Design a protein around this ligand. Sequence first.
Ligand code: NAG
Ligand code: NAG
Lengths: 238, 237, 11, 11
Amino acid sequence: VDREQLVQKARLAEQAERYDDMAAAMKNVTELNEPLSNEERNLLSVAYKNVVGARESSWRVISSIEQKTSADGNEKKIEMVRAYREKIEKELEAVCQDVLSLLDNYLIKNCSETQYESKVFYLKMKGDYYRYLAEVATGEKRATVVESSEKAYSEAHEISKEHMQPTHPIRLGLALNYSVFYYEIQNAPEQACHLAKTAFDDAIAELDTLNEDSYKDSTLIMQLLRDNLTLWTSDQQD
Amino acid sequence: VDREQLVQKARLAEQAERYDDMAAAMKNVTELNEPLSNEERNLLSVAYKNVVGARESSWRVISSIEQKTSADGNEKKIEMVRAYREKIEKELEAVCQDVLSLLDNYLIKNCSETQYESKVFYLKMKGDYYRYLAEVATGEKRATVVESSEKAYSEAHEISKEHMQPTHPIRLGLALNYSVFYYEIQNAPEQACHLAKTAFDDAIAELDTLNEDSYKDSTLIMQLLRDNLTLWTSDQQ
Amino acid sequence: TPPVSQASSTT
Amino acid sequence: TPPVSQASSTT
Ligand SMILES: *[C@@H]1O[C@H](CO)[C@@H](O)[C@H](O)[C@H]1NC(C)=O
Ligand SMILES: *[C@@H]1O[C@H](CO)[C@@H](O)[C@H](O)[C@H]1NC(C)=O
């Protein structure tokens, strides 16, 4: 099985929406120890985002049922519901750790000093998945991963500001996710609103730095930024 | 864990839409070697229908890709696409074989003479899952499973006509799925239309036989039948 | 256009 | 209410 066979399998899996296959295929690609292309990077990210997302959805549904079942007072139920939520939870964690291992030992690791774009991408991912862990963790567990997510987002932010156009989709993407981190995890709506607001204004101020390759991505992400600001400026008035 | 906890896990899985867990849970229940209640029958059926369905969808998407990929005349592409479709196909077959093993070794097996409703339900499932296999099989493989599906639907139809009201949801369901078998698998539109038509008419003629517990199911399946009779009459024209 | 089918026993 | 999001690199 060649590398191209794997990337192709990953493309097929995505179309079949069998994302478990997709990640596994992109993981094997990553484990070939060679750098990832833009597309390969995209596939890897998309694959693992959907896997972690699927688990997350199911985790929220069961965790929601674990709230009802306990409030009711039933005992036999709380046992199985809790145990099932922990099963899903352990799957979600194992997935994130799976991505994080790839980022720490392959992608970020083998990045040269001149590859800022990739380093920001991978550092943003690192932040994303540590963030996904934070959502299902508590106490020392949560604080620690919330810390790792912070460190990652922060490092990526530093690089992006120093090496990327404010309109670069990767920098905008970082801003979006980082701001979300602030709002949802840090519970810091001001910082969240600020980062997003700043990022959006910076891109506009240099709205001329757009390029053919990714003007669509940029504008779209800029729109997502404004959306969040709108979605936050309402919750912060109720 | 206990039976009650396995069935509960199956309900939780359904809510999360983790149907693999749901099927595995109901499989473990069935393997307890005890009869299945109506709820448990439903959970098991819903569980494996969604699993086989999920595979079927993926199988179609890839199989289609395998179609236009071969037409283009690629090489290394057809190599992977074909191998992936076969993987999904193998999965789909394994699921069906899983339920079929449950039906032959537990459900249909442990049923007594007096349990006609259950036997009709299970025999319908048997026909269903053999039908799903036919959808992805060809030649010896297909003819053999199309045969088994036929045998199962027929035997279920014999017992339904002989022991159940024309309005009984299980009898209507059998008619619906059996008529679908004729149209989609047998490619026998006349027979498909006839069975579905006949079934609908019978229930209509004995509309008074409905009961509180399942009137909604009956009327709905009757609708589905009429829907097919309308969906088939236009497509064959 | 798949035809309609069903399989839910009466619970 | 989830804050909207996006992480899909430049292909
Ligand atoms: C629904 O119809 C499809 C298409 O004919 C059939 O394959 C399937 O068995 C039916 N669903 C169930 C639960 O039997
Ligand atoms: C989109 O936002 C959600 C919610 O914060 C986040 O969990 C997810 O990582 C983001 N999507 C991607 C592809 O990173």
